[PDB]
Amino acid sequence: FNSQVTVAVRVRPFSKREKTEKASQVVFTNGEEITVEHPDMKQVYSFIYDVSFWSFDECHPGYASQTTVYETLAAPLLDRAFEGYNTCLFAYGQTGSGKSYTMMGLNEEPGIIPRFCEDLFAQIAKKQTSEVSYHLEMSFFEVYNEKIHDLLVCKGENGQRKQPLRAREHPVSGPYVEGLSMNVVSSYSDIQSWLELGNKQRATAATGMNDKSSRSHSVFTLVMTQTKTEVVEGEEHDHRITSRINLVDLAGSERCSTAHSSGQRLKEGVSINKSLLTLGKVISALSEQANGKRVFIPYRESTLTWLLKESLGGNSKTAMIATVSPAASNIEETLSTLRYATQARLIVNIAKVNEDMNAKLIRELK
Amino acid sequence: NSQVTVAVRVRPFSKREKTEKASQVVFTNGEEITVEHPDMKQVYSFIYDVSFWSFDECHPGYASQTTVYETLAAPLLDRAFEGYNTCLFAYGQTGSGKSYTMMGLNEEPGIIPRFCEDLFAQIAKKQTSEVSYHLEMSFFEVYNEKIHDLLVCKGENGQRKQPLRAREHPVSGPYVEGLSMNVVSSYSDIQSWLELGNKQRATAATGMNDKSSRSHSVFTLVMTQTKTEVVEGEEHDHRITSRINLVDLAGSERCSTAHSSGQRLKEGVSINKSLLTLGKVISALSEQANGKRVFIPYRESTLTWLLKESLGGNSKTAMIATVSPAASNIEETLSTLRYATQARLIVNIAKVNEDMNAKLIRELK
Numbered sequence: 001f002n003s004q005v006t007v008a009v010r011v012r013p014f015s016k017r018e019k020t021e022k023a024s025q026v027v028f029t030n031g032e033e034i035t036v037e038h039p040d041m042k043q044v045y046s047f048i049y050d051v052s053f054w055s056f057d058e059c060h061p062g063y064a065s066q067t068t069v070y071e072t073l074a075a076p077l078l079d080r081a082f083e084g085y086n087t088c089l090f091a092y093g094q095t096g097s098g099k100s101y102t103m104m105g106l107n108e109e110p111g112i113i114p115r116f117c118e119d120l121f122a123q124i125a126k127k128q129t130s131e132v133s134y135h136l137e138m139s140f141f142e143v144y145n146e147k148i149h150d151l152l153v154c155k156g157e158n159g160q161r162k163q164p165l166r167a168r169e170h171p172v173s174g175p176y177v178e179g180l181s182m183n184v185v186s187s188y189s190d191i192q193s194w195l196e197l198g199n200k201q202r203a204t205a206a207t208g209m210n211d212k213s214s215r216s217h218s219v220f221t222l223v224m225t226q227t228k229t230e231v232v233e234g235e236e237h238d239h240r241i242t243s244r245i246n247l248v249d250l251a252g253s254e255r256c257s258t259a260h261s262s263g264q265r266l267k268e269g270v271s272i273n274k275s276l277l278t279l280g281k282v283i284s285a286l287s288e289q290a291n292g293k294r295v296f297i298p299y300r301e302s303t304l305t306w307l308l309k310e311s312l313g314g315n316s317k318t319a320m321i322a323t324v325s326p327a328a329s330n331i332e333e334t335l336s337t338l339r340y341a342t343q344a345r346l347i348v349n350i351a352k353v354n355e356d357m358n359a360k361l362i363r364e365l366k
Numbered sequence: 367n368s369q370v371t372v373a374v375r376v377r378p379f380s381k382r383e384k385t386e387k388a389s390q391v392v393f394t395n396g397e398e399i400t401v402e403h404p405d406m407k408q409v410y411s412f413i414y415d416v417s418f419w420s421f422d423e424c425h426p427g428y429a430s431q432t433t434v435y436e437t438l439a440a441p442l443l444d445r446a447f448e449g450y451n452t453c454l455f456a457y458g459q460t461g462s463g464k465s466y467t468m469m470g471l472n473e474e475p476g477i478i479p480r481f482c483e484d485l486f487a488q489i490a491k492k493q494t495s496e497v498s499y500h501l502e503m504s505f506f507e508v509y510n511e512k513i514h515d516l517l518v519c520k521g522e523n524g525q526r527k528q529p530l531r532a533r534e535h536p537v538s539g540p541y542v543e544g545l546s547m548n549v550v551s552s553y554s555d556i557q558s559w560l561e562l563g564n565k566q567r568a569t570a571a572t573g574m575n576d577k578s579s580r581s582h583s584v585f586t587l588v589m590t591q592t593k594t595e596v597v598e599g600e601e602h603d604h605r606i607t608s609r610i611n612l613v614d615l616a617g618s619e620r621c622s623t624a625h626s627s628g629q630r631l632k633e634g635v636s637i638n639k640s641l642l643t644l645g646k647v648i649s650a651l652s653e654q655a656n657g658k659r660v661f662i663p664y665r666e667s668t669l670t671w672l673l674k675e676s677l678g679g680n681s682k683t684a685m686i687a688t689v690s691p692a693a694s695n696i697e698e699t700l701s702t703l704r705y706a707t708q709a710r711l712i713v714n715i716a717k718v719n720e721d722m723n724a725k726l727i728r729e730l731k
């Protein structure tokens with residue numbers, strides 16, 4: 001299904017930081033349409049999105065919680081997953097824009113990721129029948145300085161236990177990680193425990209912009225297979241489908257002029273910005289492709305893109321969520337983010353469902 | 367006039383081999399018997415007029431012991447009673463189960479007891495006062511091209527392994543000098559003497575087993591039919607007889623695998639020589655069975671030399687190859703069936719039986 005990507009946006013409000021150092025509002029939501037006032041009051045930029053939420057305030061219409069945003073954005077992808085489609089959602093934006101606060105959220109207001117996860121487990125409960133057997137697995141890993149590390153591993157005891165892995169490209173199913181310890185899911189409780197361990201061990205750190213920053217890229221994969229009956233008088237349960245869900249928490253530019261730092265700090269920031277740039281180029285060429293343009297896609301210019309190839313494009317029903325700030329202090333960043341997103345709507349891939357009727361005759365009969 | 371039937375009796379797995387969960391390599395398709403390489407390097411097929419598949423009770427066409435007897439061994443009882451000589455060969459490697467087919471078990475008999483008691487009972491069919499019947503038997507072994515009588519009990523001496531010699535009767539055919547005979551009317555007494563016989567038989571503990579056959583054994587039965595006829599006077603002297611010759615051949619064995627020394631190697635050499643000779647002989651007999659005129663090297667060994675008349679002319683015979691199905695002795699099985707086949711061995715290679723599901727070809731067409 002040559003089909004597009006759902007692009008959603010969430011303007012978080014200002015903070016103690018702006019209260020201490022006054023930073024006016026410039027982002028404005030006409031219900032859902034995004035409008036940004038230049039502090040010079042010379043231009044208003046405006047952007048239109050398939051989805052909007054106005055978390056700037058709780059009161060005016062357009063407001064939405066984590067789960068409102070879920071049932072707007074991610075529950076449909078749950079639907080397409082049970083339809084059998086691979087699915088993607090990934091975040092974008094700067095530091096302190098609640099990109100984690102949205103996707104993952106915290107303990108008290110967890111994000112789209114945990115909402116979807118419990119919805120998925122109970123949605124399997126809805127059809128926990130012998131009509132269709134279900135089997136769910138998940139992996140969870142991180143990207144730091146182009147190095148891949150396993151979030152679900154209890155590290156050993158050593159001064160250096162951040163065991164790197166490497167990537168390999170199956171000629172058919174595409175990239176994957178060696179040693180990636182994909183584990184079985186019984187329920188959202190198990191998912192929760194896994195996520196807790198991983199987010200704990202993630203290489204994150206405090207800084208001058210936020211108390212805790214996602215200095216590494218995080219990937220959270222689920223794959224649900226569902227074995228169903230075929231339409232034959234013989235072995236009926238010989239049909240199966242798979243659906244691969246991919247939820248991605250990226251990092252922010254973290255411009256060093258404000259993110260004054262040194263050593264390993266600046267190193268991580270450099271690698272991050274490099275990665276995100278590569279991603280942006282991927283996104284742009286994808287948009288041009290969706291415009292019908294014959295274009296070479298530098299998936300291979302980094303690791304993030306390479307792994308997420310089949311999700312940024314390929315075969316999956318996908319979405320992006322962009323996080324943006326109201327403070328004029330970072331209006332440039334928010335504008336860049338909004339332009340990224342409004343370009344992002346234009347992207348399409350060709351999404352179907354992964355029966356994998358291999359050595360089955362079912363697809364051939366079909 | 368003679369003719370031979372060439373057949374094969376497949377053994378099933380043992381408790382040992384089932385415990386190993388040893389792979390099967392022998393399979394059948396009709397009388398055809400195939401061997402599949404474990405690495406599928408070669409899929410061979412040997413062909414027989416008959417195949418005795420005692421691999422699984424549940425299989426279509428299971429051959430039981432009496433099945434074998436009434437399939438291949440029994441007709442020879444008819445022909446021997448008819449009045450021409452009969453023989454049955456058994457050839458196979460150690461552990462194949464030659465005794466299991468031939469002698470069988472004390473509870474599950476073989477073609478030996480089946481034929482013996484059947485022929486007793488079947489001569490009792492015709493036990494008239496017009497015709498007299500008289501039955502004898504002899505039993506001897508060939509070993510290093512030496513003949514030894516199996517019916518003399520060893521004495522309290524270095525040995526009684528007294529070598530004997532072959533002479534060619536000017537009229538009838540070759541026979542053995544000094545061979546003591548006994549007369550029979552009971553298989554119980556057949557067995558009485560055999561108790562001595564297969565004890566005196568020379569044997570050796572190889573690696574393939576603890577008691578291997580290191581000497582060919584020939585067991586023949588003497589059937590005498592004396593009839594009287596109207597001659598315008600005293601009715602007397604119409605004589606017809608026949609012979610029934612059982613051949614417990616010995617296994618070949620590659621000396622390269624039987625790494626050893628001395629007398630063991632000598633016996634292996636002699637045995638292989640005999641087998642080769644016999645293979646030549648039998649093939650020649652087949653070619654004449656199709657009518658090819660040809661010279662026969664009967665004289666190249668003692669065994670065939672004795673059997674010459676039992677093999678030629680009006681002579682009905684069969685040979686049973688014994689084999690094991692297990693993947694582990696696959697080489698031995700291929701060897702055995704190769705000896706057994708009388709035209710050639712088929713071979714190919716094929717790893718396409720998996721059409722990935724339910725004959726995908728039916729869709730691809």
Ligand SMILES: Nc1ncnc2c1ncn2[C@@H]1O[C@H](COP(=O)(O)OP(=O)(O)NP(=O)(O)O)[C@@H](O)[C@H]1O
Pocket residue numbers: 011012013055056094095096097098099100101102106210212213214215250251252
């Ligand atoms: N719209 C919002 N409404 C209420 N609270 C918010 C909102 N957005 C963010 N927050 C909170 O403010 C804090 C700032 O967000 P923060 O988690 O630092 O962004 P982030 O996703 O960490 N960016 P990065 O660290 O670069 O990945 C978070 O701890 C949230 O709990």
Ligand SMILES: Nc1ncnc2c1ncn2[C@@H]1O[C@H](COP(=O)(O)OP(=O)(O)NP(=O)(O)O)[C@@H](O)[C@H]1O
Pocket residue numbers: 376377378420421459460461462463464465466467575
């Ligand atoms: N068709 C069969 N069904 C069941 N068991 C069999 C069959 N053929 C052989 N066996 C077993 O294998 C053995 C074959 O005869 P036996 O002489 O006892 O073993 P062996 O070592 O093969 N002796 P040999 O006759 O000299 O090969 C028997 O002891 C049986 O228990």
Ligand SMILES: [Mg+2]
Pocket residue numbers: 098099100101213214
């Ligand atoms: Mg974050």
Ligand SMILES: [Mg+2]
Pocket residue numbers: 461462463464465466
């Ligand atoms: Mg045996």
